[PDB]
């Protein structure tokens, strides 16, 4: 119930706080899935890319706070180009069956193997992907290794 | 109980947007805000790799709210633009006309993309847009006014615009 290899000591520490794990069914694979899509988010923007998934926000909820103007809003997207462009990164089952879930938060749809949706290889680099896909073979390993196929599967859907 | 052409994505998305059980011939309406959907997506299948368009229509609004903010742009939630370029800046709306002849702006606020019943593109959308998005839209609105004609609701379309 601790955290895999894959996953970095940053990333894992950073995850903690950000969602009440216990609480959900299959909670530790839901934190590591996430954690998953992070990573992504640090691979892509490896700056053009401002990452706002998991981003510190207290100081900024206290200024508004001192001002009483307005809280910053909960429904953020992963990362945004600063082309002006917000992107949302997504772990799909079939880049086949899929339609896009936001017009405003485009979707960076990625197989358990790795490979990009059309639109979301576009937007990479043949580095980007590489690590990426490389990455997530390293994560499908211990997926099987602990044999939680049906797990993630399941939490992807 | 969606037509055939209109994805199915597009037909779960469109059926809360609005009341048409209240509406005269909401059905129709429906569809034909559904042709629109479809059009601002066949446009926005086009990238820079960025994405060149955000596709502003049914979107949630605290969606529509933020990147707003990010964008230093703002719409009143009446008159939204239907989507947003990003290179150059400008939002614009999907219109569905019978003449494009005398056409002049919709509104003040955004610019308009108006196209026929057959799928021709109004002079200034034509313009604006690539070769490539007018083939998506031609052919995508030939499959709906086929869907049209074969269950004979056209002068229910026709009087609706």
Redesign the interface.
Known sequence: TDRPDHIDSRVWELSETQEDWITQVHGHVRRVVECWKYTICCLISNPQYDVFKWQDRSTIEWICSKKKVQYP?????DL??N????YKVLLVSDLSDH??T?????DLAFNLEGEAEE?CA???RGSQLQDIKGFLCRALEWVVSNNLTQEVVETIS
């Open positions: 809003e909960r429904d953020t997207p945004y180009d082309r002006a462009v917000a339609s896009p936001s017009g405003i938060y485009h639109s576009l937007v990479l």
